[PDB]
From a paper:
Using the experimental apCC-Hex structure as a seed, we designed short loop sequences computationally to connect adjacent helices to generate an up-down α-meander structure. The sequences and structures were named sc-apCC-6-LLIA and sc-apCC-6-SLLA, respectively, for single-chain antiparallel coiled-coil proteins with six central helices. As the peptide assemblies were hyperthermally stable, we heat treated the cell lysate (75 °C for 10 min) and subjected the soluble fraction to immobilized metal affinity chromatography (IMAC) and size exclusion chromatography (SEC) to yield highly pure proteins in a minimal number of steps. Circular dichroism spectroscopy showed that all five proteins were α-helical and hyperthermally stable structures, and AUC confirmed that they were monomers. Moreover, DPH binding suggested that they had accessible hydrophobic channels. For the antiparallel α-helical barrel proteins, the seeds, models and experimental structures for sc-apCC-6-LLIA and sc-apCC-8 are very similar. Thus, the success rate for making these single-chain constructs from the seven antiparallel designs test was five soluble proteins (71%) and two new α-helical barrel crystal structures (29%).
Here we describe efficient routes starting from validated parallel and antiparallel peptide assemblies to design two families of α-helical barrel proteins with central channels that bind small molecules. Computational designs are seeded by the sequences and structures of defined de novo oligomeric barrel-forming peptides, and adjacent helices are connected by loop building. For targets with antiparallel helices, short loops are sufficient. However, targets with parallel helices require longer connectors; namely, an outer layer of helix–turn–helix–turn–helix motifs that are packed onto the barrels.
Author numbering: 3 to 25, 37 to 60, 75 to 101, 110 to 131, 147 to 170, 184 to 208
The structure:
């Protein structure tokens, strides 16, 4: 309950940093790995078992994005990976807490927009990530209540 909420607020903090770094692809990749580790902890606490499996799949997808970013420092595939994460978030919302489920679907929508922006604007993506961080912070607030 409260533990999972604290791990969500930590992810939001890491997303806000990523948005600021978008203006150092190597540093963002490291943060995405941290977010994946936090997602693994949330999955462990839940178990329940279905949502945990889906969160683990999202963690691996973020790891793939991180390895893709490290390769760029040394895009279209990242977009497809983000769309997969969105489809997984919507699946988690379908299982869930109606208010929290709606905030997840909204996060999935914004995640789809970021994927679209990757096809073409870096400033817009940073704003989208900050909106997602706010929505995650909101979900954590409902968990503590």
């Amino acid at each position: 309950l409260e533990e999972i909420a604290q791990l969500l607020e930590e992810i939001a903090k890491l997303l806000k940093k990523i948005a600021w770094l978008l203006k150092l692809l190597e540093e963002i990749a490291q943060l995405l790995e941290e977010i994946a580790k936090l997602l693994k902890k949330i999955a462990w606490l839940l178990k329940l078992e279905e949502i945990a499996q889906l969160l683990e799949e999202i963690a691996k997808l973020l790891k793939k994005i991180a390895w893709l970013l490290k390769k760029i420092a040394q895009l279209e595939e990242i977009a497809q990976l983000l769309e997969e994460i969105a489809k997984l978030l919507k699946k988690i919302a379908w299982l869930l807490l109606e208010e929290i489920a709606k905030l997840l679907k909204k996060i999935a929508w914004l995640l789809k927009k970021i994927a679209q922006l990757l096809g073409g604007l870096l400033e817009e993506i940073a704003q989208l990530l900050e909106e997602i961080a706010k929505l995650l912070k909101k979900i954590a607030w409902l968990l503590k209540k």
